[PDB]
Amino acid sequence: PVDVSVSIFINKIYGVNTLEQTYKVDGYIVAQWTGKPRKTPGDKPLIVENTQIERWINNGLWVPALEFINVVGSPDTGNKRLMLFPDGRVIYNARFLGSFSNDMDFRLFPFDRQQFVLELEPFSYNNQQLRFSDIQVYTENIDNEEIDEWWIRGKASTHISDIRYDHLSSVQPNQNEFSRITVRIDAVRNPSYYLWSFILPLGLIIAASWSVFWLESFSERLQTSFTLMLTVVAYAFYTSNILPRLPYTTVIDQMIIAGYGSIFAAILLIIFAHHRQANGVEDDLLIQRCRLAFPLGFLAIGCVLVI
Amino acid sequence: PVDVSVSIFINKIYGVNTLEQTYKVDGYIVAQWTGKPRKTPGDKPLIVENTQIERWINNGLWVPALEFINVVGSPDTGNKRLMLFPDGRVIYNARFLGSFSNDMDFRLFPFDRQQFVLELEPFSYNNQQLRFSDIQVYTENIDNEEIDEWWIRGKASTHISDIRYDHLSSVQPNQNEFSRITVRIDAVRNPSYYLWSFILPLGLIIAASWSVFWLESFSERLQTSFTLMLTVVAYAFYTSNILPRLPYTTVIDQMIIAGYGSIFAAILLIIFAHHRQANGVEDDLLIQRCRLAFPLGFLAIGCVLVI
Amino acid sequence: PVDVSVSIFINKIYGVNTLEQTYKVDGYIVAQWTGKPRKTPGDKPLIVENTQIERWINNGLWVPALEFINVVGSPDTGNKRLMLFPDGRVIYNARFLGSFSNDMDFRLFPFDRQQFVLELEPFSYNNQQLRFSDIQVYTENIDNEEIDEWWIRGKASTHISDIRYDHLSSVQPNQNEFSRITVRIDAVRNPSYYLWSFILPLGLIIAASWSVFWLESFSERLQTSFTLMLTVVAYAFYTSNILPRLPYTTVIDQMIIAGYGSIFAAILLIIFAHHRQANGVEDDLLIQRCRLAFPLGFLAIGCVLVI
Amino acid sequence: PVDVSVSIFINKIYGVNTLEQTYKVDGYIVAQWTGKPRKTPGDKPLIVENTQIERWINNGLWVPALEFINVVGSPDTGNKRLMLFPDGRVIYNARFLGSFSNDMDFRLFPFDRQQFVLELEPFSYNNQQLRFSDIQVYTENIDNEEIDEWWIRGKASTHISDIRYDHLSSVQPNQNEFSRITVRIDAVRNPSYYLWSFILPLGLIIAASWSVFWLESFSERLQTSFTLMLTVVAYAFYTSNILPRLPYTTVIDQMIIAGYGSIFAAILLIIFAHHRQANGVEDDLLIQRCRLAFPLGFLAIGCVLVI
Amino acid sequence: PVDVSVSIFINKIYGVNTLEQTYKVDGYIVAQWTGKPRKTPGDKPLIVENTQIERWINNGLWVPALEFINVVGSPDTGNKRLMLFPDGRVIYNARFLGSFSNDMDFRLFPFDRQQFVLELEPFSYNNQQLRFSDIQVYTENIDNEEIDEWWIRGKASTHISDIRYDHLSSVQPNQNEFSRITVRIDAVRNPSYYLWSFILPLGLIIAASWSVFWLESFSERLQTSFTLMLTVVAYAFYTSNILPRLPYTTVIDQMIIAGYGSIFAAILLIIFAHHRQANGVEDDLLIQRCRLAFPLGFLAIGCVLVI
Ligand code: NA
Ligand code: NA
Ligand code: NA
Fold first, then answer.
1. Which bound ligand lies closest to the C-alpha atom of A224?
2. What residues of chain A lie within 8 A of the CB of B55, using their CB?
3. Do E40 and E185 belong together in one domain?
4. 3-state secondary structure of A89
5. Which residues of chain C lie closer than 8 angstroms to B223, CB-CB?
6. For residue A226, which ligand has an atom nearest its CA?
7. Whole domain around residue E43: which residue ranges?
8. Residues A119 and A43 occupy one common structural domain
């Protein structure tokens, strides 16, 4: 095979779309292999700029195509340089821009700890014809800085693995596995905006929903709970635009569920308190000891749910 | 005709847009036919990368164009390889990315069970000049995994059928039918998010709407029902962004309809209870036996509506 | 002139955007004219696939360009075949995809009855150099089926007319008129979703707004009407995302107007009832005979407004 | 210089985006200059269709590039004809489609009276090498018709002016000014939809906010004003999606401001009426003469604000 | 190296997207270097228009590619002129259009004072082979005018710095640093729209929330505070569409936080006032001296928070 050395530079990571679970990564790729010795004008290496490499490719120069596996849509490439040394090595430098995708598990939404994965693999040549020697990822632009609400932490993990493509084994009998480079960049979500915009207001809504039992008569406490339910409904919408449709529940969706549960349990308890009287003579105070018991049970529920 | 063998690899299915009834499918296509024996440099097969196939096509090589019938917009193709063996066969490998469309029947919205259809057909050569022998679809990347809220279940159904184009019979007298490949991938929607975000909150709203009859006087129970109607209105909006405009009603839209019906039937019943008095002396308890009859009728309605 | 025969095939009509008054039409166009006899390899006709027609065009073959007049944006063309018979005729087959536009009058919004218009006209050759003989439109894919909320009814109307371009008369003295093909596909909007989502809920809101006069005192009936107005406001928004900004009023906007009018007329009547007392001794029942007169006038208003 | 005559045809103006202050204009451009006499096949003029003009341009034909100065993004050109007469003149006909921009002053929002400006200027040749003789704009398609909510009024104003580019004076010593064509199309916004959707409902909200002073006690009138403020808040949002962020206030934003001012002045006046009692014995009627004075002052404010 | 002189002209800055922290800059770039003397037809300089420069580039002319570092997506270039003087200098004039990005710190949101940064750097040639001599930025189109809600103030700051690329040092031993031009355009946000749309309405909401303590009994003051909280919730949403997710709090988000704090502190104080009675005989006036103390503390909080 041909020993190909890659040096991926990351310019910036931007536009991390949580709803679509995609992100956009800019930067440069510098692939370098070796070939036969060639003659250049002077001792200096030749610079082959874009839209003119095609004359060299139609001349017979071996320029492989390196594609991104996990990309969404066509990667919007820009300028490209094919720098030709006369000692033998050929260097393909290109700028890439594309939307990449990952799994992006969302069990803990505001306190999330995710990673951004770049995958590179030759489109046509397998590991018997093109082998990745090593990659050095230069994430010095975003090594210790925060993009949007994501704090990039650590360096970039590099890994070279041989992926196997069983769909291509009908045209290649034995050699049908490809050398893939994986680049992993960790990212920790900053939870401050969610903390002061969704979590603590909903805690205040929960305390206000607890405040129904301090009232004195029945219609006023029903109307208190109804306008409280209105608030919880409105809040549920606010969360929609912050995270996609998930089979599980996150922290904020669990808080919405707890708000609905608290308010409707209060309404049902108030109804059962009102219809407690068989002949309309009994006072209703024995069941209304939930001024100091219902918040305690709610705190126990929250403490269990945190762990 | 020419026997063409296709091997479609599916990389990932993403972005299933329910409102537009489209979805995006990435992956590779490997078409393979046979031709005259040719000579290559060495015994090894020749690899013809992208943007250089045109020299071979202008030289006179037969490379058919395979289009997607059910695609929405232009399919955003990427890299392509035209691998030439010297024993005779020509292999056209290409990467595709495009938005596909299907019927996507939506009778049961959250408990839906849909399929994703890929259709492939030659644009110009009919079955008398190009015949699809067989297709093996390698859906091993998403065989037993869930994309977004869709759990992909089973393998990919393959079918080769001869579709007939009557619009082209004016230029082709007898042979005007084309061989189309259909690839069917089943998908079952995960109903959990809808279950805890729309169905059970609306059930709590229904119980709260039932709670009007436990009040004691008239203006308070009218205001109770009015703020309850407000909630149902708000909920109706939340559903809009989850499913398109349909002639029929789904489960959630039927729940909104049942909420409106319950609240307005309660308001009309309360009004008729108030105006039951001919001279203002009669008590109103005979018509207010709906504390234990109106929910029973609603449960009967729901049980009939489920089946 | 040259007699050109067109056979437009319609694959699917999708994405009818009411707010933008555009729609997207896929399918194929098959133009066919006649020319000098030519020699082909063998007796079989020659197939000229895409991205290779340019060699024949630079060789000197007459391939006219047919553009779409009413299109919005560039029509996203795909594959194209230039099928050359040796008996003389040249057949240009191409696939088109583009957003088309029409007037789309919206007097009756949910019970609308619209049409989809495709217009085709040569860009450069007038009727003295290129004449459309006839068109057969093959709308067999959507002849008797419903797209989105639009039920396609009937076949496709064909018409050939000579349009006149006065802007081009400075460069062409007498012959400056072009032969345009118009294809009309009727479509009837399915009113069910609007009927059970906007019309009947707003009727329930109207009845609830009528329900104010059954109350007994003043502050409660003012608050009843205020929360009712809140509902009407919310509903007005829901309609915004369903139809564009229009100088006139549709059915649903007239229902919103009637809701505002009913509620504010009720508020003004209640205020005038309260201030009817010169010395605070008169009872207010003479002006509150609108329990059985205000709905009757509203029904008369609605019956007049329907016709 | 070379005398260039332009004849701009306007097909349709659509998609006037008020928030972005852009609009989309379709149509054709017909540029015509004169040159050396040439020989054509026969006496007829030659038609040079698109994607084949490049052979004539590489042959040495002078085809200038005319760009649009005020365009947003790349103007999506379509088909183009380079019609060559043998008597000497060369005619460049092209179809354009692009998003144009203007200042679009918005002092009176619903009763606005705007214009749509098209600017054309050669990219490379100044007025010493290419001079625009005259332009005739053929706006006969939209001369007396209304697009969206904009009624196009009058014809299209034509003007040829020499614009000066000081950035290019480092490479051109004296001749660095360019001949620009400006095309002005007036448009009057139809105010009906805003009149019955925002202005008159907000007037009803204003009258309902005036209705607080007719109540009898304090808590009910505070709650009346609070639910009224809720309505005004909701209305403020509805306006957001109709006009961009502006330093000044339009009519509708002034109505929102007047609604907030009326309601909060009523709340402050009610509070000062309640705390008017030094010992709780005084009646509060002297300050509540605003049943017939507060609307009069509001009418004076509105009459001053209109002029 | 080669001395390259740049003269950037700015046509217009538009579409400053605060949520994405990007902006769009149109205009022209005029690069100029020197080379060997050449012969042109006549004494006049040669004009090389677009899509024909490639013949000169394949002939062997040195045209460097200048890229934008901070751009988002591919910069949508338009027409380009390569003006060749016979005295030796080569002038590359091109039009650019692209979305640029900056840090855009948002500590004070409505009273913001930002800058727009354009960065230009050769893609392939380092400072040993191409050196930027000087840049004159001609921002005369927007020198003293306001774009959208941004008032452009001052001229454009020019700076030439040598940036160092450590990722490219594996292919270049010592010379691996590039000359970058930075263009800084200051912009001050106009705070009027936010001042009369968010700040003063929320101040009125704060005063209305203070108004709870003037009521007389308990259930009415709880319901007053609940409908007030509803308003604050609604307002929080309005702000979402005006600024992105930030770790810190701006002015308007601090006002939302203060509204929630004031209302929930009022609710807690009212609850503690109600449960102040050990046996139900004590009057509650000592803790309700916050009619003239709670606003004073709120004013102290606001005065501290401003500085
Ligand atoms: Na309320
Ligand atoms: Na509300
Ligand atoms: Na919304």
1. 1
2. 58
3. yes
4. strand
5. 220, 223-224, 227
6. 1
7. 1-190
8. yes
